[PDB]
């Protein structure tokens, strides 16, 4: 005979925005991988990463020799014009995250000694990628090393 209480917040979650946040998210988290990152949020996070990268570069003793830097899209683009291209990027906060070596490239080329092919195979470039990533994880003044 008695009529139980009307449970309005569930109905507010129905009729305003037609879904149900109230269920344990362990269903969706355990079964389904997370949603892929869209646009907008990408541009905002890249802009914040550009600002954090500027402020992290002005503190560290950057190599002042020929490394002209462009913060272009979260990637500092350390490029000496003669020989070498580096792209660096921090992951988290400003103080304590190390650097990631997103793309390393060697600009030195002669199309005759290297027999019409690249001077250095991607195997060796990836090896130097691991070595410089390790010496970044040594956490000295990193850019000089």
């Amino acid at each position: 005979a008695r009529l139980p209480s009307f449970a309005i917040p569930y109905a507010i979650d129905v009729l305003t925005t037609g879904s149900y946040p109230r269920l344990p998210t362990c269903i969706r988290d355990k079964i389904i991988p997370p949603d892929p990152i869209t646009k907008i949020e990408k541009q905002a996070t890249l802009h914040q990463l550009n600002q954090i990268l500027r402020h992290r570069l002005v503190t560290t003793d950057l190599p002042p020799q020929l490394a002209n830097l462009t913060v272009a899209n979260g990637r500092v683009k350390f490029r000496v014009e003669g020989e070498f291209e580096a792209t660096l990027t921090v992951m988290g906060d400003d103080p304590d995250v190390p650097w990631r070596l997103l793309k390393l490239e060697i600009l030195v080329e002669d199309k005759e000694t290297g027999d019409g092919r690249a001077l250095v195979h991607s195997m060796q470039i990836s090896f130097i990628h691991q070595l410089v990533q390790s010496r970044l994880f040594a956490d000295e003044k990193p850019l000089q090393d």
Partner: peptide
């Protein structure tokens, strides 16, 4: 239901890079 055969010299240079700059975990 390659390798252009000038990689011996690059590899020796890689070993000299390993010695002159060691990896650091």
């Amino acid at each position: 239901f390659s390798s252009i055969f000038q990689r011996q010299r690059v590899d020796a240079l890689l070993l000299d890079l390993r010695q002159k700059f060691p990896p650091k975990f």
